[PDB]
Amino acid sequence: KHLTDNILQPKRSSDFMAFKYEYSTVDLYREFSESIMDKARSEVEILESVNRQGRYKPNVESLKLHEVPEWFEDAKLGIFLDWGPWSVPGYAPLKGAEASTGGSYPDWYEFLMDNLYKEYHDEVWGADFRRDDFLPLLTGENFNSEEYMLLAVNSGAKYFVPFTKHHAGWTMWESEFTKRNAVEMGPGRDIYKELIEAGKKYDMKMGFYFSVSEWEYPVIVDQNLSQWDPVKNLAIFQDALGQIPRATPLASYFPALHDRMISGKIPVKDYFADYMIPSFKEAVDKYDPDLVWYDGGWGSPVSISRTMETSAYFYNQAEGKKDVVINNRAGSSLSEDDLIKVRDLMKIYLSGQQLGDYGTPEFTIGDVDIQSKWEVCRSISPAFGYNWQDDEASSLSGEELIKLFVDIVANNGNLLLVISPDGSGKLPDIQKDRLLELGDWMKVNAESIHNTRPWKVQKENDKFFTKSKDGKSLFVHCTNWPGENLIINTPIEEGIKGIKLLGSDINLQFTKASNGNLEIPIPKDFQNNPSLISKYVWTFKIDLN
Amino acid sequence: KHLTDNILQPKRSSDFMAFKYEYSTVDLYREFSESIMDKARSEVEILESVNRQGRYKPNVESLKLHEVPEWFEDAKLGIFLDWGPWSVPGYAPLKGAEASTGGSYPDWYEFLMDNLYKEYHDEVWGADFRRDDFLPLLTGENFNSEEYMLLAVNSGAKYFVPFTKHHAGWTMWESEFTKRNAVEMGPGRDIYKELIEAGKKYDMKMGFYFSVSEWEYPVIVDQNLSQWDPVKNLAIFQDALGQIPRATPLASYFPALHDRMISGKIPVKDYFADYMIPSFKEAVDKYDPDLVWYDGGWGSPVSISRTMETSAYFYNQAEGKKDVVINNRAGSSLSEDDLIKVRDLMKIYLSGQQLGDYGTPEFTIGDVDIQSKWEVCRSISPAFGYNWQDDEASSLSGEELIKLFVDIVANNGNLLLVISPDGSGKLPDIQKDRLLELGDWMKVNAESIHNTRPWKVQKENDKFFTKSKDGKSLFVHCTNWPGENLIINTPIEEGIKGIKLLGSDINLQFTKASNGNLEIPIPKDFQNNPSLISKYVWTFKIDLN
Numbered sequence A, B: 001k002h003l004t005d006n007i008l009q010p011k012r013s014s015d016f017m018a019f020k021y022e023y024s025t026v027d028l029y030r031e032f033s034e035s036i037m038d039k040a041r042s043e044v045e046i047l048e049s050v051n052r053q054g055r056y057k058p059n060v061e062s063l064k065l066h067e068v069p070e071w072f073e074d075a076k077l078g079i080f081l082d083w084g085p086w087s088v089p090g091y092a093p094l095k096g097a098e099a100s101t102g103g104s105y106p107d108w109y110e111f112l113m114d115n116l117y118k119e120y121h122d123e124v125w126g127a128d129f130r131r132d133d134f135l136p137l138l139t140g141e142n143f144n145s146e147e148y149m150l151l152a153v154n155s156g157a158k159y160f161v162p163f164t165k166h167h168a169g170w171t172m173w174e175s176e177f178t179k180r181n182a183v184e185m186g187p188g189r190d191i192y193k194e195l196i197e198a199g200k201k202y203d204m205k206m207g208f209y210f211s212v213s214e215w216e217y218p219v220i221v222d223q224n225l226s227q228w229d230p231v232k233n234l235a236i237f238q239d240a241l242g243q244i245p246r247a248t249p250l251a252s253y254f255p256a257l258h259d260r261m262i263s264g265k266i267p268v269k270d271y272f273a274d275y276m277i278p279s280f281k282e283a284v285d286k287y288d289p290d291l292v293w294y295d296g297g298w299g300s301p302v303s304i305s306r307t308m309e310t311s312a313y314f315y316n317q318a319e320g321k322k323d324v325v326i327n328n329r330a331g332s333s334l335s336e337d338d339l340i341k342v343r344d345l346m347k348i349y350l351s352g353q354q355l356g357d358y359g360t361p362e363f364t365i366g367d368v369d370i371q372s373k374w375e376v377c378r379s380i381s382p383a384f385g386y387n388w389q390d391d392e393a394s395s396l397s398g399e400e401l402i403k404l405f406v407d408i409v410a411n412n413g414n415l416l417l418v419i420s421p422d423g424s425g426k427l428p429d430i431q432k433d434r435l436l437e438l439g440d441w442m443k444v445n446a447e448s449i450h451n452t453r454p455w456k457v458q459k460e461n462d463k464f465f466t467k468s469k470d471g472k473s474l475f476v477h478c479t480n481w482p483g484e485n486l487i488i489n490t491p492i493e494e495g496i497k498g499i500k501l502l503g504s505d506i507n508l509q510f511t512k513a514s515n516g517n518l519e520i521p522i523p524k525d526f527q528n529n530p531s532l533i534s535k536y537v538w539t540f541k542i543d544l545n
């Protein structure tokens, strides 16, 4: 049904024993809650003071004055490291479980194991195997931060975004605000510190991926919620993050249900003020990222989540130090009344999406505005997170990946390419292969990608265009080998100085027909094996007067 | 912590395999939903026509005019048969899991196994053992309907109320509106029909216990609820019945989560109109009960649940045939506005409790109005439903039960005594012992209980009074043996014709002291061993002029 005898399929160990962390949720309440809330209050005061004195205030109009940095316009390619406890089971259906994005989500396994993936989980892992039993299996024994960074450098990428904290709240950094962190649970290392250090050594821009909301969080309450509640003054905070209907804002807390879903999380009174804001601040202050990649901002509107304050802080602390950027996932600017009207009834929803420097279409590019900056995120397959089933049949070829990349870049996009390791931190050879092919292609063709801008036309048949910033170099990316002759129909107004195929030093002949078309004879010597010069896509650089 | 080697503790069998009912929820949608909704629509039309033409209308003012029948005033003792799939595990904590009533609830195990009782369940039954895996174990191999009816008769009871349908929706009767019924699942018999036939044979008034709401019900919907929903047009209806915060009114339906919680339930569009009303009507029409014992009426207000229509129907179909009664659990008459104000903020809640013929204090009697009719429900322990742990330390003695019963009856109450069999249908010996003592007491003393009314004084020291309905007999229930003389301080205005101790034919002489006290010498031959005549409580019958 779901359990195979395939060695590649991660499955329950014969030596499985329940993971009961040193501190229960109640232990954390008794021993750490007051300490953390005290620390949080002092950190939030500091952040609020920075914003009071700073250029950027926590409001849409102030934050809108921030500009996309040159480096982000220029980067074109980033690497998105989708690694966390979900990497251990490494499962989504190959087909039929797609979200509205068109992607599938192995990286939602921690949540979906109780519902959509429950049949699989029960057969492969066991009904008695809880979410947190994946944490000790996230060993990282094969995870080498510097090698991942070198892989990204070699691929042609210009930024690297680790999944620093996803929806179940495990932090890749050693945080003072949670024990659900990479040092205490899983690999026993500050993975983010290692990646940040590697990024500095290889001169790579570094992101900070941060889920605003979490699926469940233990909170301190005055009144209990039902006559059945076993533990006074604790409940479980839930917002819209899970998407499926749930109890909101509070569910009754039951240790035998909840503890092994929330190991390490310290109860607080106010999820946002006492935990989310100070942990954001901590990571920014300690690691100094170039980019914030919010996610999970649909949990609560920003009036509640207070992400305009984290955004203002990020920009203010960067002033005079570095150029930084934020995606568009902080959350909604809608009022309670407009959120009600959306539920009762997309037009109104989009009117409330007003925060961030760039758009983030996911998997499906769709109807992007090419006049503004955007970034599409996806892996080589539909899967966000490792899928042990992913293979040649399910994944883009190197060829397809390169052609998609070119299309993205011509249309003003960046590609944020997801790579998804297994529980040990090993990258599947198929993903490594596609990175190698992209990198090998970029070694020849990168000047037509990095630091370019859209042209007046993006596409002509099988050809995609980019231009240099100054407009004096036009790049024609042919996704089919043009053979004996390259003909360009789109009018070129300026005089032409010369033409070359990237990967060859030889200057090409060229003439303008009277109808305006460009004719470019291709040397016979290239026709035998054009892939020797460049594989899959052949890029011609046209120098203008 | 919870799994013992005690043979009395019900636990997972070594031969366990998942119960996957021959009809899945989706099968029932495809194969039965249309037929059930066809029948439902016709039955609702018929019910509405009966109410249009009948004396009682489905509104508070009309229903209030219905009076408690003489038989219910007279009955004093009923048997409440708390038997269902929960009887198999037979568990609640002996202490510390009490509800607001003061009772504990083994009969909530099907719901609480996922939260409050989850540690026990996981250890004793297994996380892979689902709610519906209890249904095949409800064998009824030791359940004999005639014997249960005779147990009620011999105990002195005058009505018998089986748990015909509790909160998870298993019906004791063979229903065309659900396959979660006693013929298709569990004992393979129409249990209710057997009890109804026995009740007719032994001239016992019969109840119909009916949970208005159910914890979960599969419903047919136009739009799905999330991008993760695997099955088009099905969802799970939930209201306030579960008490703990939940998704309401709809949860996303996931077969691997829900199917083994809702085996047998046929999806409908409108839980109330397409299932609740017609199933109520079916049982009333087929079995002709004398009493409706609503429960679980806190799920939805009556504006939504439509229980004023089922109440009017019950009265109307009985009118001119038999005198019938309804408890006070149909639900709330509050408006949406008042329900909101209750949630934001007991006074308002009680103002909306306006339907029914009598009050139903549960376990805790509290400050009852003795001028109106009331009925307390409880077992001999705090436990509603079988608790394998219940023992002499946890349970009222026969002595304590009889004294409590006398107190109830002197104060205008009925006792609806809960008896709780195990999964096979066997009654625990401790419960049998208490029934033996109560029945032996009633064989001597029942004339002082049945057909009586409160007197002008209810209690004088250790003495409780009742009077015959005709006013010609006063019964003095002494909870301590009076010894050589029975002295009654309360004035008796009427002349006295004769006095006897029930259980003895001896006519007792008496004098009035000058202070007015009645002085009744007690024969020497009673003094050594008065318990031979009657145990625990001695009742003197005073015949008046």
Ligand code: NA
Binding pocket: A063, A064, A065, A066, A067, A068, A356, A357
């Ligand atoms: Na801006």
Ligand code: NA
Binding pocket: B063, B064, B065, B066, B067, B068, B356, B357
């Ligand atoms: Na009435």
